[PDB]
């Protein structure tokens, strides 16, 4: 679930970057560092829309690095518990359902999956199908799911979905 | 505080001079661009000294008043004793 908020970040600049394009170097460092990272509080950082303010660069005593606090507006992807966001399943296997919500990778175990869906490897793509074959989920197919929880592992977030609720799944 | 109504010594203190010189020398030793034209100067301390004499060190001295306020003085805005 994407969001647009204001974040805070601190950049340490080497003295080699002093001179012309100093503020440009600060902006480039901010883009390189902040974009692509994910934090538990704010979720994945999609991109930065605008950089609000670069604070006064405080020269740290010793080690000569200048510290520039940066205020900026960035797009942040943040799944929440119980939220239904349309997703795309990337992989399907017996262990569970592997789905993707933009930058968010979601795993859906079969325990929460309704029993109408069964695993049939005999299909050309290894996927899940029902006996009536009305409901078929394969690669890159868009399906809806609700996030039951969120967990972060090694600065990377991983969520778990579920298909318990009605009017959810294939559209 | 703003540039106007600064109530502090217009003179750079010896402590400010020492710390500015050391910081600028460290910056020069870490490949910072030199604001002044150096004539065969390889010692970062001496280059920082000649920048101080040239009013070229790109450092703002933030003077904290005991009530929590501060005044930002550029090195060029201060008059050096030497």
């Amino acid at each position: 679930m994407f969001y647009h908020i204001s974040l805070e970040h601190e950049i340490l600049l080497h003295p080699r970057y002093f001179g012309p394009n100093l503020l440009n170097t600060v902006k480039q460092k901010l883009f390189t560092e902040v974009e692509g990272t994910c934090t538990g509080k704010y979720g994945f950082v999609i991109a930065v829309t605008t950089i609000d303010n670069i604070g006064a660069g405080v020269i740290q005593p010793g080690r000569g690095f200048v510290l520039y606090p940066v205020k900026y507006k960035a797009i942040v992807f943040r799944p929440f518990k119980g939220e239904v966001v349309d997703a795309v399943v990337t992989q399907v296997n017996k262990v569970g359902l592997f789905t993707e919500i933009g930058p968010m990778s979601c795993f859906i175990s079969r325990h929460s999956i309704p029993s109408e869906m069964e695993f049939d490897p005999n299909s050309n793509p290894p996927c899940y199908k029902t006996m009536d074959e009305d409901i078929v989920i394969q690669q890159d197919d868009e399906i809806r799911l609700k996030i039951v929880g969120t967990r972060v592992d090694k600065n990377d977030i991983f969520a778990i979905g579920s298909l318990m609720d009605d009017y959810l799944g294939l559209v | 505080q703003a540039n106007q109504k600064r109530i502090t010594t217009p003179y750079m203190t010896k402590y400010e001079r020492a710390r500015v010189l050391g910081t600028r020398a460290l910056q020069i030793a870490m490949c910072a661009p030199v604001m002044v034209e150096l004539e065969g100067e390889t010692d970062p301390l001496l280059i920082a000294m000649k920048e101080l004499k040239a009013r070229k060190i790109p450092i703002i001295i933030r003077r904290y008043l005991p009530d929590g306020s501060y005044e930002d003085w550029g090195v060029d805005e201060l008059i050096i004793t030497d």
Binding site: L22, V58 | P58, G74
Partner: peptide
């Protein structure tokens, strides 16, 4: 104390006059 009672800031405008960058 002295050399510790104040704080140093980098002036970005004044950096826009540097040589070997």
């Amino acid at each position: 104390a002295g050399t510790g009672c104040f704080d140093l800031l980098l002036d970005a405008e004044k950096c826009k006059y540097g040589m070997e960058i």
